[PDB]
Design a protein around this ligand. Structure first.
Ligand SMILES: CC(=O)SCCNC(=O)CCNC(=O)[C@H](O)C(C)(C)COP(=O)(O)OP(=O)(O)OC[C@H]1O[C@@H](n2cnc3c(N)ncnc32)[C@H](O)[C@@H]1OP(=O)(O)O
Length: 334
């Protein structure tokens, strides 16, 4: 059988699905189906500091040339009338206790995506939030201190994870998506999972950040590109000065840009103050899960394209879910 449930379990996946199914049982809605959450990829990776920042801080011995992290891909499924439906996916970057600052004990959501067929409709958003809150709860348990979220909605005709969304599945505007994450985080705060959360500018300001080398540096995130762009801006400005003499600040730029886009970037403190400073090493009890299909989002989108796996109607998404689960089961076995 190539079911979602028969996908190999992990502690993380089991923690999340139990949280979700406990929630659903409390709601006692006759339309809800059993939810399955599976981690389908886990591997060690490194994020490499880009040239501009490398020249300025890395070659100086001030900053690590790269940061080690574990990427995980997980999916949530709802079984309904005996049929599997993949309705939520997320990739995360987890920087461990052995990671050098400024990244140590941080988690970053690379991206998340959904297709809006969860049944019942009235519990869909609540279920998304239970998954995200459960995730924050879990990594907090392991000893990660801080979560990071870029509230970036996809551009028109862009799919983060699932190929071909339903035409009538609306894409939230920035403000709506921002409020969505705030509602999730506020619930996590009420449950004493999250200590507090701030926009990136307020956080930087309070942490007394003085140098770009202090800003957490994640794979594919907004800020590494802002810093490269900024550093080339400084390079151009130096050029014009040289022109002025006839021989033809970074922290200021970063703070300006942070303030401009602060609403879009959440810094989430799981463990604050003291307890954060005398933590044991993080030991993740789940094994690595090699799965080339799910290392980052590109491979699955390509697979979907090639085999025509759309998630554009309930029935189409269920069929694509079968094809997805078949691919995952077969790539695993041999
Ligand atoms: C993990 C990250 O860092 S990546 C950033 C987030 N990922 C994405 O934006 C990818 C694509 N978006 C999605 O998958 C989904 O929108 C999610 C998972 C983010 C949230 O899904 P939901 O819980 O259903 O909330 P969403 O804000 O999309 O929609 C809720 C309601 O607002 C409506 N809505 C959404 N966008 C709009 C819009 N632009 N205009 C008017 N209404 C809208 C929905 O139709 C829905 O209405 P309903 O509840 O009456 O049915």
């Amino acid at each position: 059988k190539f079911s979602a449930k028969r996908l190999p379990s992990t502690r993380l996946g089991t923690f999340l699905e139990n949280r979700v199914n406990d929630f659903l049982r409390r709601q006692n809605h006759p339309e809800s189906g059993e939810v399955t959450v599976r981690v389908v990829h886990a591997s060690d990776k490194t994020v490499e500091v880009k040239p501009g920042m490398k020249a300025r801080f890395v070659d100086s011995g001030e900053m690590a040339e790269s940061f080690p992290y574990r990427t995980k891909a997980l999916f949530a499924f709802e079984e309904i009338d005996g049929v599997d439906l993949c309705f939520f996916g997320m990739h995360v970057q987890e920087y461990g206790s052995d990671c050098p600052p400024p990244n140590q004990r941080r988690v970053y959501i690379s991206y998340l995506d959904s297709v809006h067929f969860f049944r019942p409709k009235c519990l869909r958003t609540a279920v998304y939030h239970e998954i995200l809150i459960g995730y924050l709860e879990y990594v907090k348990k392991l000893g990660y201190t801080t979560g990071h979220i870029w509230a970036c909605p996809p551009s028109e005709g862009d799919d983060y994870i699932f190929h071909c969304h339903p035409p009538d599945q609306k894409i939230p505007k920035p403000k709506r998506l921002q409020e969505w994450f705030k509602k999730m985080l506020d619930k996590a705060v009420s449950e004493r999972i999250v200590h507090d959360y701030k926009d990136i500018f307020k956080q930087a300001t309070e942490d007394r950040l003085t140098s770009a080398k202090e800003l957490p540096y994640f794979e594919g995130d907004f800020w590494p590109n802002v810093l490269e762009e900024s550093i080339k801006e400084l390079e151009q400005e130096e050029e014009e000065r040289k022109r002025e003499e006839n021989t033809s600040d970074l922290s200021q730029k970063l703070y300006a840009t942070m303030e401009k886009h602060k609403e879009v970037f959440f810094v989430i403190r799981l463990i604050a103050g003291p307890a954060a400073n005398s933590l044991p090493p993080i030991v993740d009890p789940d094994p690595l899960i090699p799965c080339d299909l799910m290392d980052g989002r590109d491979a699955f989108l390509t697979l979907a394209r090639d085999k025509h796996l759309e998630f554009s109607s309930l029935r189409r998404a269920q069929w694509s879910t079968m094809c997805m689960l078949v691919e995952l089961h077969t790539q695993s076995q041999d």
